[PDB]
């Protein structure tokens, strides 16, 4: 049974790991990586790797990515030991800073060289943080892309679009965590359950292995048009840099009660096929969960973007 690990690198990444632990999560081992030893000490994670102690003496990297990179390379062996056993690694980090921008691509490379299916979920900085930080974040993104199997980018500017003028920052940040947390739970649930039309970790590898950009989403709905509405919500990408448009591979799992109809599955599949605007290699699954009365859950992982 496949082991999933979530690895937070730098301040943003360790904040995401803490908020996900607070939210509550099972069958996933969390690893916190940072140069900042003060922040690590406040990590709710079980495994904690302080990187670059020699180099930073427990301080953060400031805004210099080469420090993050060297810190990660210095601590390769400890990174390897914490990863060991992972079939899948999710690497989360905020791009722009000195630790994440530099260290996260190295953590990704290590995870992948060890044989883990390696997914990145990273932020780009807010426009208000200024051009040099945006440009620094962009070099990190490109480095992440070269190091991972699949990459999901969340531009922090998109948080301003969905939030209104009084939404607390911390509630806004929680919206960005949903991306990673629902992707991890969707895959976790696929592994755990033998569905009526079953998808497993081999199907995750087919869609995600050596692919570049990705979209991961979950949609939930009920009543009339539940299938169309849940599929639409699975692929709606307000926070994402990569939309469904141009996807050539899709993993799509539908979960419902005993009322789940064949017609509904087709409708959901067509919503996704049509929104991609490509001939999509669909890998389809269905799970009957009799606990569900009138809800259906549509899970989408999309890759193969040119």
Which positions from 49 through 78 interact with ligand GDP, judged by CB under 6 A?
Answer: 60-61
* Interaction of residue 240 with Ca ion, rule CB under 5 A: no
Is 60 labeled as ligand-binding?
no
With CB under 5 to 8 Å by kind, the binding choice for 176 among Ca ion, ligand GDP, none is: ligand GDP
Which positions from 122 through 151 interact with ligand GDP, judged by CB under 6 A?
Answer: 123, 125-126, 129, 133
Phi-psi map region of 304: left, alpha, beta (phi>0 left; psi -120 to 50 alpha) = left
Is 14 labeled as ligand-binding?
yes
* Interaction of residue 29 with ligand GDP, rule CB under 6 A: no
C-alpha torsion angle, residues 166, 217, 289, 248 (rounded to 10): 160
The site that binds ligand GDP (CB under 6 A) totals a number of residues, namely 20
Which positions from 200 through 239 interact with Ca ion, judged by CB under 5 A?
Answer: 200
Between 125 and 285, CB nearer to Ca ion: 285
Piece of the chain touching ligand GDP by CB under 6 A; list 92-100, 218-226, 244-252, 265-273: 92-100
Smallest distance from the beta carbon of 125 to ligand GDP, in angstroms?
4
* Interaction of residue 196 with Ca ion, rule CB under 5 A: no
Between 11 and 256, CB nearer to ligand GDP: 11
Burial class (CB in 10 A: 0-12, 13-18, 19+), 171: exposed
Between 19 and 226, CB nearer to ligand GDP: 19
Interacting residue with ligand GDP among 98, 105, 120, 140 (CB under 6 A) = 98
Got the DSSP string for the chain? -PPEEEEEEHHHHHHHHHHHHHH---SEEEEEEES-HHHHHT---SEEEE--HHHHTTS--TT-HHHHHHHHHHTHHHHHHHHTT-SEEEEEEETTSSSHHHHHHHHHHHHHHTT-EEEEEEEEPPGGG-HHHHHHHHHHHHHHHHHSSEEEEEETHHHHHHS-TTS-HHHHHHHHHHHHHHHHHHHHHHHH---SB---HHHHHHHHTT-EE-EEEEEEE-STTHHHHHHHHHH--TT-SS-STT--EEEEEEEE-TT--HHHHHHHHHHHHHHHTS--EEEEEEEE-TT-SS-EEEEEEEE---
* Interaction of residue 190 with Ca ion, rule CB under 5 A: yes
Smallest distance from the beta carbon of 59 to ligand GDP, in angstroms?
11
Is 13 labeled as ligand-binding?
yes
* Interaction of residue 173 with ligand GDP, rule CB under 6 A: yes
Smallest distance from the beta carbon of 194 to Ca ion, in angstroms?
6
Q: Binding-site residues for GTP, please?
A: 11-15, 98-100, 129, 133, 177
The site for ligand GDP (CB under 6 A) is made up of: 10-12, 15, 60-61, 94, 96-100, 123, 125-126, 129, 133, 156, 173, 176
Where does this chain bind Ca ion (CB under 5 A)?
190, 193, 195, 198, 200
């Amino acid at each position: 049974m496949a082991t999933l690990k979530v690895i937070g690198v730098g301040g943003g990444g360790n904040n995401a790991v803490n908020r996900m632990i607070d939210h509550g999560m099972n069958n996933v081992e969390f690893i916190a990586i940072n140069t900042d030893g003060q922040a690590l000490n406040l990590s709710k994670a079980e495994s904690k790797i302080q990187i670059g102690e020699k180099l930073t003496r427990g301080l953060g990297a400031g805004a210099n990515p080469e420090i993050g990179k060297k810190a990660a390379e210095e601590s390769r062996e400890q990174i390897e030991d914490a990863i060991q056993g992972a079939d899948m690694v999710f690497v989360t980090s905020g791009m722009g800073g000195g630790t994440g921008t530099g260290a996260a691509p190295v953590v990704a490379k290590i995870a992948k060289e060890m044989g883990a299916l390696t997914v990145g979920v990273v932020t780009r900085p807010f426009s208000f943080e200024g051009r040099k930080r945006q440009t620094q974040a962009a070099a990190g993104v490109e480095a992440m892309k070269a190091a991972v199997d699949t990459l999901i980018v969340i531009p922090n500017d998109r948080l301003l679009d969905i939030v209104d003028k009084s939404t607390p920052m911390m509630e806004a940040f929680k919206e960005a965590d949903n991306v990673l947390r629902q992707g991890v739970q969707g895959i976790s649930d696929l592994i755990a359950v033998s569905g009526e039309v079953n998808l497993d970790f081999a199907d995750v590898k087919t869609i995600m292995s050596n692919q570049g950009s990705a979209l991961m989403g979950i949609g939930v709905s009920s009543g009339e048009n539940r299938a169309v509405e849940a599929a639409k919500k699975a692929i709606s990408s307000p926070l994402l840099e990569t939309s469904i448009v141009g996807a050539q591979g899709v993993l799509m799992n539908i979960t419902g009660g005993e009322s789940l109809s064949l017609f509904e599955a087709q409708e959901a599949a067509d919503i996704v096929q049509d929104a991609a605007d490509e001939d999509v290699n669909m890998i389809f699954g269905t799970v009957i969960n009799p606990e569900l009365q009138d809800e259906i859950v549509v899970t989408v992982i999309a890759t193969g973007f040119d």
